[PDB]
Ligand binder design. Structure first.
Ligand code: ATP
Ligand code: ATP
Ligand code: MG
Ligand code: MG
Lengths: 464, 50, 393, 333, 464, 38
C-alpha cells in the first residue's frame, strides 16, 4: 500500500492513498525525484486530510522534478530527528541529516519533532537574572535564566549581530548544552557562527540546526521544531541546563504563510495564515522550562515593515519574559546595538528581584529618555534654547544616556574595529545612576559613544 | 583621445569596406558548394542517397 | 578569409540527425496573457520546460489532476487552443559557459544582441540548491566598487550580498555600473583569483536603457568580462521573473569553477511585480500587497545562492548587488524589508541627499555592511574603522 | 584596442552572415530535393518501410468514484453474463432513460448521490421512484450503483451511462460484430472530426435531446450502411453528452470499445494509404513496443512529405519527413 | 466558419467557434447589433482562449444591443489602421475610420496595430537635447530629441496645457511629421486641438487618433496602439522624424484595468490588472527610436488622487528618458507650468551631455530648492524669521528661483491673455546662475512670476 | 409529480444511535459527514 502524487502546486503536494491506508497528520512520506540534476528523496509532511483518501502535504525539499503519479510511500511516523549527547558539536538540517559529516546520526535515538508542550502543572516561573555584560540589556531589559528572551527587530538592524554577541556572552562559560536553530536566516551568518564556535571550542557543547532561507517553506517550518526537539531531549532526558538560540523565529510563521493559501486556508489580516497564533503558540510553549529543568531560550523576532503592530510580532510578544526591541531609528543614530530603551521590557525588572537601586536607576533612565523623546519634536523646530533649564539639563543627560547605552560588542568588532568590552552589572548601575544625577554632565557626549564602562568613559574623555 | 577615436573610425571604415568586398568574393565560393550541401542534407534527412 | 564558411555547413549537414523518439506530447486547452494550460503530459516534471510549436518555451508551474499550468517564456501571441505541446524532458535550465561574456541574452540564455549563437559549455538548472553552511567560508576578499562612500562605510566583499535600495533616479544603476567598470583593472591581471566576472541582469528596463548600460560598459571596457541578462519591459512577465535566476545560473557556473562573479539585479522590485502577475494569472490567491506568499522565497532562493564557496569547492564566489526601488522613500515597505533581511547590507540612496549634493547619496545611518571590516584591506580598515558610525552621529 | 575588437566583431559578423545565407540556401535546396524525391510512390513506400525498420529496434474519477465504478462494472458483468440481445438492448435503453432522468432532475440526482454510508434510504427512494417502470436487471444495477458512494453527483450519471454503453458493447460482442462496431464507430469519429460545426450542434444538451438524436439520424445514422449496435451507441451518447463534445465523445466511445477487448487504438498519419504489408508490419511492431495488441487508424496527410507518424495515448513517435525537414531548417547554427 | 456569441459581460464578449476555426489572439471579429438606433457592426478583439473552442474578446464599440447566439465572423487579421502620407491632416478613431472624411483611408495601406517591439540590436540611447524655450524644462529636465518625455500630474494641474505648449514649441517648426493620440482625454480637448492645429497650419503635418473618454475600454486601450502604428510607419517606411503626443497613457492603463476586471483576471495591488507592467511595456517599448530613425514622444500621465506611488505612474516612470512631474503644491501657488523641480528629472542632465556650466547651475538650483523643501515645516510653523541668516538668504533666493521657473507659456494666452515668451538655453543658464549667486535677491519676489527672461525680469522690476 | 413526494418521504426518513464519519481534517477543523440530528 503506497500513495500516488495527484496534484503538485509549488511546495504543496496532494497524494492519493488506498481508502484503508490514509496516513495520519504530520506523518512523513517519501517520494522520489528521478531527474538526474535534481534527483533526491523528497520528504512530504502530511498537513491535511481532504477526503476521498487524498492527503495534502508540505514538501521539505524543493518539489522541482516531481512527477504526477509518482509513488509516495508512508513512513508511519512523523519527521524524526536524532537526539543524545552525540548531536553536540555537529550541524544538522531540519530533517536531522548531518551536514558536516553525512550519515552521522543515522543510528542515534530518534524523536518525533511533534509533541505536546509540558503540562501546566510542570511550569514554574523563572525570576533569576542572567548577567550579560551589555549595559542596556542588564539595566533596562534584564534577561532571565531559564526564561524566554527575544530580540525584536526590523530588517537589517543587527539582530544576528546581537544574537551572536549573546552567544559569545552567555554560551562561552555556560556549563550546559547549547542548541542554535537557524530558522530561515542568512547562510553566511550561520557559517560565521559555526566557524566562530569552532574557534572558541564552544562547538563541542553546541548542536546547530539550520533551515536557512534558501530552503522551501516546509523546512523553514519544521527546523524550529527539529532544534527544539534536541533542546527538549536535553531538558528532559538529561536534566542539563540548556541554551536554545533561534534566529529567526518569524521565518517559522512566515513559512506557514507561504503555504497557507496553497493549503486552502482563507488569509487573515495582513495576509497571514489564520492559524498564526495557534501554530506559534504550540512552538513557543514547547520552549518553556519546566521546574527543575532549564531552557534559557533566546529568539530573534523579525518585525516586517519595521511595524511592531504587525500580527506576527504582536502575537510573539505574549510569549516572552524579556524583549530587547531593536529599532531602525536608534540604529540610524549610530547607537549600536540598536536597542529602543523605551519599547524593550523585562518581567524581572521589579524591585523585588533586581533590587531597589537597580530598579530606581533603570526607571529614572526610562523617565529621562521618554521626556527627551517627547521633547525631540519641540527641539527640532523651536530649538533647545527655548526649553526650560530643567528640561535642557534633562536633554543633555538624555543624550549622554542614549550614547552610553551603546556598547562596543565582541561580535561588532568588525563594525567598529575596536575590541569588545564587558560591563559588570554593578558598574552599569553605578554609571547610569551617576548619569541620571548629572555627575557626568561636564563631559562631551561623544565621550559616551561605544565605550562600555566608567574606565573607558574616563579614557575617552581624556582622549577628547 | 579624439585623434585615437578618429583613427579608429578610419580603420573601422577601411576594414568595413575590405570585409564587404571579401564577403562579396566568398559569396561565389559558398554558392559553388550550396548545391552539394543541399543534396547531402536531403540525403541525410531521407536516410538514403538523394 | 577562411574555409569555415562552407566548412561549418558541411559539418552540420554531415553530423545532423533527427532520430525519432517518443515525445510524450499534450495539447493546449487554455491560453492567454502568458499562461497556458496543457491537457496531457502525464510524466511532466514540476518546473519542466515545455516546447510549444512556434519554438516558444514555457515552464510547468502548476500540475493539477486535469491540466498543467505553464508560464509561456517568450511571445505568447502564437499560443492557441488545440495547439501541440512537447515536453523538453529537462527541468527549467539555461545554457552556461565562458561564451556568455560580452553577450546580451534572454532569460532563456538565447542571445538578443544580434550576434551569433552562444557556444554554451553545458546547461545548468535554474533551481539548484544554494551552498550549505558547511560549504561556505567567511567573506574576506574586498570587491572594490571604486566609490569612496561604499568602500569606506558599507564595504562590499566577494561573497557578500549588498542591497542598493532607493527611490527613482538616486544613483543605483550608476553605483552598480561603476562597480562593474572598476573591475577592469582586475580583469587585465589575467589571474582568476583577482578577475571578477560580472552579470548585469536587467529586469523591466526599457531596451534603450539596457543599450545605454551596454554602451557605458563598452566605453569602459567592461563588456570584455560582463554579461547582460536582459528581460526588457516588453518581454512577458515570465522573462522578468526568470531573468535573475538565469543570471544566477550563469554566475554560479563560474562560481563553482573557482572564479569570482558579481551579479547585479536591476530591479528585483520588477521581478516581484512579474512574479505577482504570473501568480495572479495562474490564479494563486495572493498575500499582502497582492503579492504571492512566496515572494520572500522568490528573492531568498535567488540571493542566498550568492556565496563564498569553501576551498574544498574551489574557493569561488558570487557577489550580489540587488537593486530595489522604494516608493516615496519608504524603506519600511514589504519587499524592501524582505530584501534587506535577505542581504548582508544596504546602500540606501536617498533623493534628498542626492539633491543636497551628496553623490552617490548613501544615507550613512540607514546604510550598513554586515561584513564590515572583513571586506576591507587593512589600510582601509585602519583609516575608516569608525567612519560610518561617526557620520551617523 | 577597442577599435581592434570592433573590427574583429565586424569580421565575425560578416562570417556569420555568410554562413547564415549559405545554410538557408542549402536548406531550401534540400527541401526542394526532398519534396521532389518523396513524390515517387515507390520512394515514399521505401521511406515508410525504412521508418518501420527504425521502429523495429526501439481515469478522471477519484478513489471513491473509481472503486464504485469498478464494483458497478463487476456486478454488470456478473448480471449480464447470462443476458440476451433483446435483454441487453432493454438494459441499455433503460440505463439511458434513468441517466436522462437524473440529468433532468438535478435535485433527484443530488439526493440519490448522497455519499452517506446508509444505503437503505437511497435504495428505498430509487424503488419508490422507478421500480414499476423498468426490468429487474437494470433496476438491480441502478440500485447497486446508488448504494455505492460517489465522489460527486455527476459521477452517478457517468456510471449509469458507462453501464449503458457496456450493455450495447456486450450486445455487439455476443453478435460477433466487435471488430465491425469498432471500425465503424471510428468511421463516424473521423466523419464528425471533419465538418466540425456539426460536432457543436450535437454537443448542445440544453435543447431537448430528441432534436439532437433526430439530427444524428438525418445526417449520420439514418443511412443503411450503419451498424445497428453502433447506431444505438451513437444515439445513446448524443442523448447524454452533458457538455462533452460529440466528436470527442464518439472517439472516446470507440476507445472504450477497443479497450473492452484489451486493445489500444493508435492513430497513424501517412502521406498516402499504407499498403497491407506495411500495415501489418506497423501493427506488429507497435504491439511489440507497447506490449499490448494495437489497432491502427490510418489518416491521409500529404503535408507530412511522405513520412509516417504514430500517436498512442499521450505518446507520439514522429517520423514524418516534414518533421525532419523542419528540424533541419531550425537546426541551423 | 463563423462563431456564436455565448456570453456578454459589458464590453467583453465570449464567442464560441468550431474546433478548427478558433481565431488567433488579437484577431478582429465582426458581430452585428440590429436594434434600431444602436445598430452597428461591432468589432471584437480576441483577448483569451478559454477552451472548448471559446475565445473571450474585447469590444471596441459598446455592446449595448448585442444578442446571445448572433453570428460572429473573424476577419483573419488583427485590427488594422491606415498608414501613409495620406494619413496626415486627418482625424481617426482607434479602428482607423476617419472622422473628418468618413470614407477616407480605406484604399490606403493597412498595418496591424499589434507588432513586436524593435529588436534590441536596433536600439541606441538618444542624448541630443531638445531645447523647448521653457526655463524649467531647459534647465532641470532637458528633453531628449528622439527620446521619451512624460508630463505627470494630478487632475487640473496643466498636463494638457503643457502638451499644447510643446506642440506649439516643438511641432510648430518641426521638419518631420507628428501624431497626436488621444487615449481618453476630453472630446472637447480633441476638437480644440484639431481647430488649433488647422489654424496654426500644423494640421497638414500631423495625424490625429482620438478614441476619447466616451469610448469603451477596448477603444481606449487600442487607440494608443493605433496612433503608435501610424507613428511607427512614419518612423520606418518614410524615414521621417516623428513626434508622438499621447494624452493620456494613464487612461490606457485604466482601460486595461477595466478589461482585466471584466476578463476575470484577479486584481493586482490597487485593483489594476496583473499585467500592468507587461501591457505598458508592450505599448511603450514600441515608441522607442531605432538607430537611424527618430521618434520623439511626449506623454501626459495622469496620477490618480495625486498619488505618485500609484502602480500606473510608478510603472511608467521606468520607461521615460525625461519626466516633468507637475505638482498640486506648485500649481496652487500659481507657478505655471507647475513643474515640481525636485521630483522631475532627465537622463541627459549629465555634464558630459549638457556641459559643465548648465549642469552646475541646475544642480545649484536643485540644492537650493531641496534645502528650501527641508525647511518647509519650520517655515510653516514659525516662518523665515527663526531661520539662521544663511538659511534665510537661501530661502529668499529659493523662493525667487521657484517663481522664476514659472513662465508665460504661449498656450496660456487663452487663459490670462498675456503673450507667451521663449527663453534661450544660454539665457536661462545665465539667469539662474545669477539667481543662485544672489545678484537678484534685492528685487521683489513678484518680479519673477510668469515673466520668462532677464530683459522681461528687469522690465517687470521697473514696473514694481 | 411523484418525484417531489418520494423525495420528501426520503428526506423525512433521514431512536437509533447516530454516528458520523470524518471526511476532512486540517488546521484544527474536522468535517463530519452524517449526524443528521446534530
Ligand atoms: N555619483 C553621481 N554623480 C553624479 N551624477 C550621478 C551620480 N550617480 C548618478 N548620477 C546621475 O543621476 C541620475 C541617476 O541615474 P541612475 O541611472 O544612476 O539612477 P537609477 O537609480 O538607476 O534610476 P532609475 O529608477 O531611473 O532606473 C542620472 O542622471 C545619473 O547620471
Ligand atoms: N501655463 C498656464 N498658464 C495659465 N493657466 C494655466 C496654465 N496651465 C494650466 N493652467 C490652468 O489650468 C487649467 C487646466 O489645465 P490643463 O487643461 O492643462 O490640465 P491637465 O493637467 O491636463 O488636467 P486634466 O487631468 O483635467 O486633463 C487651464 O485651463 C488653466 O485654467
Ligand atoms: Mg536604474
Ligand atoms: Mg488634460
Amino acid at each position: 500500500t503506497a500513495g500516488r502524487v495527484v496534484r503538485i502546486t509549488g511546495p504543496v503536494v496532494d497524494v492519493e492513498f488506498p481508502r484503508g491506508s490514509v496516513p495520519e497528520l504530520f506523518n512523513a512520506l517519501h517520494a522520489e525525484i528521478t531527474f538526474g540534476a535534481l534527483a533526491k528523496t523528497l520528504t512530504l509532511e502530511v498537513a491535511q486530510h481532504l477526503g476521498d483518501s487524498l492527503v495534502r502535504c508540505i514538501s521539505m525539499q524543493p518539489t522541482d522534478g516531481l512527477v504526477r503519479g509518482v509513488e509516495v510511500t508512508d513512513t508511519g511516523a512523523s519527521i524524526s530527528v536524532p537526539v543524545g549527547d552525540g548531536v553536540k558539536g555537529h550541524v544538522f538540517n531540519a530533517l536531522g541529516d548531518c551536514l558536516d559529516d553525512p550519515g552521522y546520526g543515522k543510528d542515534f535515538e530518534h524523536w518525533s519533532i511533534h509533541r505536546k508542550p509540558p503540562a501546566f502543572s510542570d511550569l514554574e516561573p523563572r525570576t533569576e537574572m542572567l548577567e550579560t555584560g551589555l549595559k542596556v540589556v542588564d539595566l533596562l531589559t534584564p534577561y532571565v535564566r531559564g526564561g524566554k528572551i527575544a530580540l525584536f527587530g526590523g530588517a537589517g538592524v543587527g539582530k544576528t549581530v546581537l544574537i551572536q554577541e549573546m552567544i559569545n556572552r552567555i554560551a562561552r562559560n555556560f556549563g550546559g548544552t547549547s542548541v542554535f536553530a537557524g530558522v530561515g536566516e542568512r547562510t553566511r551568518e550561520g557559517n560565521d557562527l559555526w566557524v566562530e564556535l569552532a574557534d572558541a571550542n564552544v562547538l563541542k557543547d553546541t548542536a546547530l540546526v539550520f533551515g536557512q532561507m534558501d530552503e522551501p517553506p516546509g523546512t523553514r517550518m519544521r527546523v524550529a521544531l527539529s532544534a527544539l526537539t534536541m533542546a527538549e531531549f536535553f531538558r528532559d532526558e538529561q536534566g542539563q541546563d540548556v541554551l536554545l538560540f533561534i534566529d529567526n523565529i518569524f521565518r517559522f510563521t512566515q513559512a506557514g504563510s507561504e503555504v497557507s493559501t496553497l493549503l486552502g486556508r482563507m488569509p487573515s489580516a495582513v495576509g497571514y495564515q489564520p492559524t498564526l497564533a495557534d501554530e506559534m503558540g504550540e512552538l513557543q510553549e514547547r520552549i518553556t522550562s519546566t521546574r527543575g529543568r532549564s531552557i534559557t531560550s533566546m529568539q530573534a523576532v523579525y518585525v516586517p515593515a519595521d511595524d511592531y503592530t504587525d500580527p506576527a510580532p504582536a502575537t510573539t510578544f505574549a510569549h516572552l519574559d524579556a524583549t530587547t526591541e531593536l529599532s531602525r531609528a536608534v540604529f540610524s543614530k549610530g547607537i549600536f546595538p540598536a536597542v529602543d530603551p523605551l519599547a524593550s521590557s523585562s518581567t524581572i525588572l521589579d524591585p523585588a528581584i533586581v533590587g531597589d537601586e537597580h530598579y530606581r536607576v533603570a526607571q529614572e533612565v526610562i523617565r529621562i529618555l521618554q521626556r527627551y523623546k517627547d521633547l525631540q519634536d519641540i527641539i527640532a523646530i523651536l530649538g533647545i534654547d527655548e526649553l526650560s533649564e530643567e528640561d535642557k539639563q534633562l536633554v543633555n543627560r538624555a543624550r549622554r544616556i542614549e550614547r552610553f547605552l551603546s556598547q562596543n560588542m565582541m561580535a561588532a568588532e568588525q563594525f567598529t574595529g575596536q575590541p569588545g568590552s564587558t560591563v559588570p552589572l554593578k558598574e552599569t548601575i553605578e554609571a547610569f545612576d551617576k548619569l541620571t544625577k548629572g555627575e557626568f554632565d561636564h563631559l562631551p557626549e561623544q565621550a559616551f559613544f561605544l565605550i562600555g564602562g566608567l574606565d573607558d568613559l574616563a579614557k575617552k574623555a581624556e582622549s577628547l | 583621445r579624439a585623434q585615437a577615436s578618429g583613427e579608429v573610425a578610419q580603420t573601422l571604415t577601411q576594414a568595413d569596406q575590405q570585409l564587404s568586398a571579401q564577403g562579396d568574393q566568398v559569396r561565389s565560393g559558398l554558392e559553388s558548394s550550396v548545391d552539394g550541401l543541399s543534396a547531402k542534407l536531403a540525403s541525410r534527412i531521407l536516410g538514403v542517397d538523394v | 578569409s577562411a574555409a569555415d564558411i562552407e566548412g561549418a555547413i558541411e559539418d552540420y549537414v554531415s553530423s545532423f540527425s533527427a532520430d525519432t523518439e517518443r515525445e510524450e506530447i499534450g495539447t493546449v486547452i487554455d491560453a492567454g496573457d502568458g499562461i497556458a494550460h496543457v491537457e496531457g503530459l502525464p510524466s511532466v516534471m514540476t518546473q519542466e520546460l515545455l516546447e510549444f510549436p512556434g519554438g516558444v518555451l514555457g515552464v510547468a508551474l502548476n500540475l493539477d489532476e486535469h491540466s498543467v499550468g505553464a508560464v509561456i517564456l517568450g511571445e505568447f501571441e502564437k499560443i492557441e487552443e488545440g495547439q501541440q505541446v512537447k515536453r523538453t524532458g529537462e527541468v527549467l535550465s539555461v545554457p552556461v559557459g565562458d561564451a556568455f561574456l560580452g553577450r546580451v541574452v534572454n532569460p532563456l540564455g538565447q542571445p538578443i544582441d544580434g550576434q551569433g549563437d552562444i557556444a554554451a559549455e553545458t546547461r545548468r538548472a535554474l533551481e539548484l540548491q544554494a551552498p550549505s553552511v558547511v560549504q561556505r567560508q567567511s567573506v574576506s576578499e574586498p570587491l572594490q566598487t571604486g566609490i569612496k562612500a561604499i568602500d569606506a562605510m558599507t564595504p562590499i566583499g566577494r561573497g557578500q550580498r549588498q542591497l542598493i535600495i532607493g527611490d527613482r533616479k538616486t544613483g543605483k544603476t550608476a553605483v552598480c555600473v561603476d562597480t562593474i567598470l572598476n573591475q577592469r583593472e582586475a580583469w587585465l591581471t589575467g589571474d582568476p583569483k583577482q578577475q571578477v566576472r560580472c552579470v548585469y541582469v536587467a529586469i523591466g528596463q526599457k531596451g534603450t536603457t539596457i543599450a545605454s548600460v551596454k554602451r557605458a560598459l563598452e566605453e569602459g571596457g567592461a563588456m570584455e568580462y560582463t554579461t547582460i541578462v536582459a528581460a526588457p519591459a516588453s518581454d512577458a512577465a515570465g522573462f522578468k521573473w526568470l531573468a535573475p535566476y538565469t543570471g544566477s545560473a550563469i554566475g554560479q557556473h563560474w562560481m563553482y569553477n573557482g572564479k569570482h562573479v558579481l551579479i547585479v539585479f536591476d530591479d528585483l522590485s520588477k521581478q516581484a511585480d512579474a512574479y505577482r502577475a504570473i501568480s495572479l494569472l495562474l490564479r494563486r490567491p495572493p498575500g499582502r500587497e497582492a503579492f504571492p506568499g512566496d515572494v520572500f522565497y522568490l528573492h531568498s532562493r535567488l540571493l542566498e545562492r550568492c556565496a563564498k564557496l569553501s576551498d574544498e569547492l574551489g574557493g569561488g564566489s558570487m557577489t550580489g548587488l540587488p537593486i530595489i526601488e522604494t516608493k516615496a522613500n519608504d524603506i519600511s515597505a514589504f519587499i524592501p524589508t524582505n530584501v534587506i533581511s535577505i542581504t548582508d547590507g544596504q546602500c540606501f540612496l536617498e533623493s534628498d541627499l542626492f539633491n543636497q549634493g551628496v553623490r552617490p547619496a548613501i544615507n550613512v545611518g540607514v546604510s550598513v555592511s554586515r561584513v564590515g571590516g572583513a571586506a576591507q584591506i587593512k589600510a582601509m580598515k585602519e583609516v575608516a574603522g569608525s567612519l560610518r558610525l561617526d557620520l551617523s552621529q | 584596442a577597442q577599435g581592434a575588437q570592433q573590427i574583429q566583431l565586424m569580421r565575425q559578423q560578416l562570417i556569420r552572415q555568410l554562413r547564415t545565407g549559405l545554410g538557408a540556401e542549402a536548406v531550401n535546396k534540400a527541401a526542394e530535393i526532398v519534396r521532389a524525391h518523396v513524390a515517387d510512390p515507390q520512394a515514399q513506400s521505401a521511406t515508410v518501410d525504412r521508418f518501420l525498420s527504425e521502429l523495429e529496434q526501439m481515469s478522471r474519477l477519484r478513489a471513491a468514484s473509481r472503486q464504485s465504478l469498478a464494483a458497478l462494472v463487476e456486478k454488470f458483468d456478473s448480471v449480464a453474463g447470462g443476458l440476451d440481445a433483446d435483454g441487453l438492448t432493454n438494459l441499455a435503453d433503460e440505463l439511458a432513460s434513468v441517466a436522462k432522468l437524473l440529468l433532468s432532475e438535478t435535485a433527484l440526482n443530488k439526493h440519490l448521490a448522497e455519499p452517506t454510508d446508509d444505503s437503505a434510504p437511497k435504495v428505498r427512494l430509487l424503488e419508490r421512484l422507478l421500480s414499476d417502470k423498468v426490468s429487474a436487471t437494470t433496476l438491480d444495477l441502478l440500485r447497486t450503483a446508488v448504494s455505492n458512494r460517489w465522489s460527486t453527483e455527476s459521477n452517478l450519471i457517468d456510471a449509469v451511462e458507462h453501464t449503458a454503453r457496456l450493455a450495447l458493447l456486450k450486445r455487439a460482442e455476443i453478435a460477433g460484430e466487435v471488430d465491425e462496431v469498432e471500425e465503424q464507430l471510428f468511421r463516424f469519429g473521423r466523419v464528425l472530426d471533419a465538418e466540425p460545426r456539426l460536432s457543436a450542434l450535437l454537443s448542445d444538451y440544453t435543447t431537448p435531446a430528441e432534436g439532437r438524436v433526430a439530427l444524428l439520424d438525418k445526417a449520420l445514422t439514418g443511412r443503411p450502411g450503419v451498424n445497428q449496435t453502433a447506431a444505438a451507441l451513437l444515439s445513446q451518447t448524443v442523448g447524454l453528452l452533458r457538455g462533452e463534445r460529440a466528436d470527442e465523445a464518439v472517439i472516446d466511445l470507440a476507445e472504450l470499445a477497443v479497450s473492452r477487448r484489451g486493445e489500444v487504438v493508435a492513430h497513424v498519419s501517412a502521406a498516402a494509404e499504407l499498403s497491407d504489408a506495411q500495415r501489418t508490419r506497423l501493427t506488429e511492431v507497435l504491439s511489440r513496443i507497447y506490449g499490448r495488441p494495437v489497432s491502427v487508424q490510418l489518416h491521409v496527410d500529404p503535408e507530412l512529405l511522405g513520412g509516417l507518424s504514430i500517436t498512442v495515448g499521450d505518446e507520439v513517435i514522429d517520423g514524418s519527413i516534414a518533421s525532419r525537414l523542419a528540424a533541419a531548417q531550425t537546426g541551423l547554427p
